Amino acid sequence: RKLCSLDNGDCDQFCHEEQNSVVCSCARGYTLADNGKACIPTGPYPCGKQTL
Amino acid sequence: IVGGQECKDGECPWQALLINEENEGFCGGTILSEFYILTAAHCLYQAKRFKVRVGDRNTEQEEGGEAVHEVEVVIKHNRFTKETYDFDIAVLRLKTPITFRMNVAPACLPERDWAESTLMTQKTGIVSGFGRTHEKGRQSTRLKMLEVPYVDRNSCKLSSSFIITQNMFCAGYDTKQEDACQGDSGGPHVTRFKDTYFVTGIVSWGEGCARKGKYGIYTKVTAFLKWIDRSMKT
Numbered sequence A: 001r002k003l004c005s006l007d008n009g010d011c012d013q014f015c016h017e018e019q020n021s022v023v024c025s026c027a028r029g030y031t032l033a034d035n036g037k038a039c040i041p042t043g044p045y046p047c048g049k050q051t052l
Numbered sequence B: 001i002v003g004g005q006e007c008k009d010g011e012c013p014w015q016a017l018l019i020n021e022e023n024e025g026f027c028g029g030t031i032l033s034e035f036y037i038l039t040a041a042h043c044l045y046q047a048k049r050f051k052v053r054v055g056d057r058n059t060e061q062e063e064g065g066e067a068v069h070e071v072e073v074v075i076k077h078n079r080f081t082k083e084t085y086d087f088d089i090a091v092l093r094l095k096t097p098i099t100f101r102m103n104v105a106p107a108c109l110p111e112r113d114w115a116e117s118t119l120m121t122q123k124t125g126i127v128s129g130f131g132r133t134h135e136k137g138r139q140s141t142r143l144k145m146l147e148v149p150y151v152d153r154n155s156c157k158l159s160s161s162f163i164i165t166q167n168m169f170c171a172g173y174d175t176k177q178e179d180a181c182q183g184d185s186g187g188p189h190v191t192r193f194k195d196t197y198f199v200t201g202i203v204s205w206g207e208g209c210a211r212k213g214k215y216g217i218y219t220k221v222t223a224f225l226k227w228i229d230r231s232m233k234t
Ligand SMILES: C[C@@H](C(=O)N1CCOCC1)N1CC[C@H](NS(=O)(=O)/C=C/c2ccc(Cl)s2)C1=O
Pocket: B082, B083, B084, B085, B162, B179, B180, B181, B182, B183, B185, B203, B204, B205, B206, B207, B208, B209, B210, B215, B216, B217, B218
C-alpha cells in the first residue's frame, strides 16, 4: 500500500499519483490548502457538507 | 425508503423532489449546483409537466426552507432505453437559481478514477427519498435515508432476472428489510468520505423493494461524469 493507496495519500479529497508522487486536489467550490492536502470551502454552502 | 431512518435537520440537503401538477412527489433528484439537478431519465416519463422542490423534509408542514423551481431545460441521455434502463440518467436546468440554506445544498461530484477506487470500494453508501416505506404502501411524507452496502458485482448479476450493464451497480441487502422503493427513483446515492458526501449513484430500479435475494440497482454516476460536466456547461 503506497501513495494514494495508503490512507488516500493523506489527501482530504481526490488523490492522483503523478510522476511517483501523491498529488491532492478538491471538488469545485473548494481550494487546496497550503499544505497541498486539505480542501478549504471557498464560500458558503460548499458541496457535500450537511447543513448546520 | 424501506427501513433506515428520517433525515434529521440538515442531514440530506442535496435531496430534490420532482412534483407533478397535483404537487405530489413522483421521483427524487440530487442538487448538483444552483442551476442543475441530477435525476433518472426514466422519471421523465412519469409526468407531462413537473417542477422541482428543494428544502422539504416533511411534505405535510411548511418549515420555511422549501422552494419550488421550474425546469428550463431537460437533458436526457440519448442512449436511455426503457427495456433495460441502461443509461438511466438526466440533468435538469432550472429557470431560477436555488438558494442554498439549511436543508438545501449540493452534493459534490467526484473525479472518476478516485471515485471508483476510493468511494465505490467503501463499505456503504446512503440512499434517500420520499418513496414508499413498504413495497405495497404509500409514499413517505417524511424524507428518509438508508445506509446501503455496496454489493459485489458478480453476486448482483447472479441475483438478477434482468441484465446489469456497466452503467449500473447494485447496493443494499440480500435478506434484511431495507431498500429504496417506488418514488425514490431518480434520487441520490451518495458516499461519505471524511465528512464530505459525493454523488455516486442515482436510484434506478429494483425487483420490487427489499425482496429476499434481490438488491437495489443504481445508475453508475462515475460512468457519466464527463457527460454530466458537458450537460452543465450548456
Ligand atoms: C425490474 C424493474 C423494471 O420494471 N425494469 C428494470 C429494467 O428495465 C426494464 C424495466 N422494476 C419492477 C418494478 C420496479 N419499480 S419500483 O418498485 O418503483 C422500483 C423500486 C426500487 C427498489 C430499489 C431501487 Cl434502487 S429502485 C422496477 O424498477
